[PDB]
Amino acid sequence: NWSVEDIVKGINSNNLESQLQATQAARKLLSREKQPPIDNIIRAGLIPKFVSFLGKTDCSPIQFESAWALTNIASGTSEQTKAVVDGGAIPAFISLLASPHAHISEQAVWALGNIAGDGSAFRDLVIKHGAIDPLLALLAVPDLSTLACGYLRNLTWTLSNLCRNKNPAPPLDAVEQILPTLVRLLHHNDPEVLADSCWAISYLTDGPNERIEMVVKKGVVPQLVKLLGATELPIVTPALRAIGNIVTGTDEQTQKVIDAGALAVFPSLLTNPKTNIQKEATWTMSNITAGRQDQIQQVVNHGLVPFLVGVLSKADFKTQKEAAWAITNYTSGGTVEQIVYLVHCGIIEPLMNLLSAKDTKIIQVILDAISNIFQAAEKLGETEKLSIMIEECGGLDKIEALQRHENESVYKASLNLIEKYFS
C-alpha cells in the first residue's frame, strides 16, 4: 500500500510505466472497502491525469487502471462524482466504450453508470454526450446468452441508471431509444439482469400516464406478471413496483395488468413475510379498487376481499394505512352489492379498531368509507342493521370520541355520522 505522496511522485514522472505503476497503487487504495481515500486522491489533483490516461490507446493497462480508479471516485458522494465529471471524464469514458478489450469497455460502462447514478443532471449530461448509441451497440447481438455474464449485468445496471430519477425524467427520445433493448434484458434468464431490468421499467413507469403508456405499448406487462411470481425477492420487489406504477394510470392501462393475470399472485403478496411486499401489494390493490366497477368485480372474483380484510386486521401500520385506502376506494366506486359483499367479509370490526390509531389521515379515510357504506345501506334500508353492527363491535364509542378532537375535517364529518345514523 503506497502513500498518496508516492502515487503523486509516480504520476508526475513523465514515465509511462512509472505512471502505470502509480495508477495501480491508486487503484488498489480506491478499491479498499474501509474508508477509501477518495478526497485525498481528489485533493492531490490526480483526477486530470487519470482522465488523460483514459486516452492512451497504446497502453491499454493504464486505460484500465485509470477507468478503475475513476470508477471508484465516481462511486462516492455527489461532490466526488462532480470532481470526476469536472475532469472531462464523460467524453473520455464514452470513447472507451469502443475499446477492443472487453474488460476496458466494461469498466467504462460501470463508470458511466456511477456518473449517471448521481442524479438527473449528470444522467442527462451523460446522454447529451451521446452515451446511449455506443452502449446499445454493445448489446446488438442476436442472443444475449453469448455475452459474458458480468459484462451483461454491468450494461443492464448502467442502462437502468439512465432510466432513473425524476425532476426531470429522462428525455422522451432517450427512453424510446432504450426500451427495445430493455425489454430484451427483461426476457433474459439471469436473475441479476432480470432484477435491474425490472428496476428500469419501474423507473420508467413512475410518472404521468404518457410514460406508462410508452412502456405498456412495448408489451412488458405479461412478463412483469411472470416475474411477479418469481421466488427471488430481488426480482419480485421491482416487478411489483412496476405493476403498482402501471395501475396508477388509466383504467385501461390497469386493465392490461388484470388481463395478464396479476391478481392471481396477490394472495401470496398480501401475506408475504416481507413488510415492503405487503405494503406495495396493498398499495397496488388500493389503485385497482379505484378503478371501474368491473375491475372491482375482478378483485372480488379472485377472492382478494378476505385478504384485504386480513391485512386490515393484522399488519404493519403503513400496510394497514394502504388497506384503509383500498377500502375507501372500493366503497367509493363499487355497486351496493359489492359493498354488501364487503360487509359480509367482516370489514366493519377491523375498520372500527383502526379508529383509535394516533394518525389523523387514516382516521379521515376510515370515516369516509363508513359514510360510503352507510349510503349503500341507505339504498337498502338497512341503516338500522348497520348502526347496530357498528355499535355491537364497539365502534360507536370511537366515533363519539372522534367527534371532538383537533382536526377540522374529521369532526365536521364525525358529527355527520352521529346525527344522521345514531339517535
Partner: peptide, 7 residues
C-alpha cells in the same frame, strides 16, 4: 445510486 468495484 452507485457501485464501488472491490477486489
Amino acid at each position: 445510486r452507485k457501485r464501488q468495484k472491490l477486489m
